[PDB]
Structure 1
Amino acid sequence: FSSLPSYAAFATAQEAYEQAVANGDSEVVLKKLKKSLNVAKSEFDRDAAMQRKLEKMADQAMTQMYKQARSEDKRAKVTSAMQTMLFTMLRKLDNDALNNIINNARDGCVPLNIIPLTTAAKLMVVIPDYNTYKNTCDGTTFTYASALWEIQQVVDADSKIVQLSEISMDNSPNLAWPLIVTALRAN
């Protein structure tokens, strides 16, 4: 803002004109002073305006390109995360029972609702009350979905271990009742 190309000419002309004015010369030198300084300031005006416009344009361009780079980095990391999640969940497919039921299909297509029903290894049961409990998972082994399951653990709504010896009719009102039963496929 102080070392512009026209600054040298403008300042030198102003200094010379004002020295001539301080010399107390005639009115012609004053008119020449006025004209020269007017045109000098007029030419300095656009040189002082266009540069300021250009700097702000350049700054906006820099900001936009920086934010584009940040967006690309975020895209790369989300892609890596999704790939990791998929390849991690792949490793639990039990690839022998799944293959055994896939090959029985006449064209390779099977409903999705029967894959956990015939290939899962663990079963979870949520029991509202004792009357429902004694009709579904009474004892230590029960049958569901044409298979045999054996109990492995029982917890309550607070996630604390509960032993089957205290799930009775008398002791029922002393438990956080939304019980969760975990079993394993037998044989």
Structure 2
Amino acid sequence: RDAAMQRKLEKMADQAMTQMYKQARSEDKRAKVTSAMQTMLFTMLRKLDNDALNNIINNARDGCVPLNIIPLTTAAKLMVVIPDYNTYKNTCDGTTFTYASALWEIQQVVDADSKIVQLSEISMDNSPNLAWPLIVTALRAN
């Protein structure tokens, strides 16, 4: 019994100790993910609080509003993806245009490979020379 019970105690102690080391690791990872949670949440919100949001919330009857309108009124930057030249022809012609009952000014035009394109290059004859998911970001012109 001096050569069987002691090894039994050794085995149970060792397996318990491995288990509780694993548990400590789990606690550490939980703390890390909690910190990531709160830092992400607090850092994302500090880029939205335009007073236009407070305006439109106050105009609401009780406060609750559809989500699909918040970026439709308060958002400052609009990105447009154009399939081909013909769509670009009657959608964003000129340096500025209007959409969603507001004015927008064209700033920067990139292509699929993220290579800046001059507005001169965008022509009917020059069309078969560019990658054609054109991305056109813009500002809330006012």
User: Which TM-score applies when normalising by structure 1?
Assistant: 0.75
| 1:137-186 deviation line (CA, Å, top 9, x unaligned) | 00111110011001001010110000101100010001111100011001
Q: CA deviation at 1:95?
A: 3.0
CA contact (8 A) 2:76 2:139 kept: yes
CA contact (8 A) 2:110 2:117 kept: yes
Does residue 52 of structure 1 match 2:7? yes
Gaps of 5+ in 1: 1-45
1:151 partner SS = strand
Aligned mates of 2:131, 2:66 — CA distance in 1: 37
Aligned mates of 1:144, 1:111 — CA distance in 2: 20
Aligned mates of 2:105, 2:58 — CA distance in 1: 29
Q: CA deviation at 1:94?
A: 3.0
CA contact (8 A) 2:105 2:138 kept: yes
Determine which of 27, 50, 62 is the counterpart of 1:95.
Answer: 50
Task: Please state which structure has a larger fraction of its residues in strand.
Answer: 2
Structure 1 equivalent of residue 73 of structure 2: 118
CA contact (8 A) 2:82 2:135 kept: yes
Q: CA deviation at 1:66?
A: 0.5
Matches within 5 A, 1:124-143: 124-143=79-98
Gaps of 5+ in 2: none
The number of residue pairs the alignment matches comes to 142
Q: CA deviation at 1:80?
A: 0.2
| 1:43-82 deviation line (CA, Å, top 9, x unaligned) | xxx2211111111111111111100000000000000011
* RMSD (CA atoms): 0.7
1:54 partner SS = helix
CA contact (8 A) 1:121 1:185 kept: yes
CA contact (8 A) 1:94 1:119 kept: no
| 1:61-109 deviation line (CA, Å, top 9, x unaligned) | 1111100000000000000011111001010113301000000000100
Structure showing greater radius of gyration is: 1
User: Which TM-score applies when normalising by structure 2?
Assistant: 0.98
CA contact (8 A) 2:81 2:133 kept: yes
Moved over 3 A (4+): none
